[PDB]
């Protein structure tokens, strides 16, 4: 099992899913096409912002 954590913009969360092309999904962190598992995200403006 693997757990990875980081913070991104609100509009780039959709980019996390495998397959999509863009800035964050091609230059920083991306998943393989046959990835198994899933992602979880939630708002943290009360803490980080």
């Amino acid at each position: 099992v693997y757990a990875d954590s980081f913070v991104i913009r609100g509009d780039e969360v959709r980019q996390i899913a495998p397959g999509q092309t863009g800035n964050i999904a091609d230059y920083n962190y991306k998943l393989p096409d046959d990835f198994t598992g899933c992602v979880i995200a939630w708002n943290s403006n009360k803490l980080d912002s």
Partner: protein, 49 residues
Amino acid sequence: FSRLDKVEAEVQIDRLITGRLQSLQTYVTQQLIRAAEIRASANLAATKM
């Protein structure tokens, strides 16, 4: 490929690999029937000879 990502392309390529295979299957079955007919005609020629 270039018009889609790499998750739902499987259903879009399965149809292009079964149809291209099922059609080939149909053609082979046609040859078997005709071969079973020529075999009956060839034996008649041998008897005639």
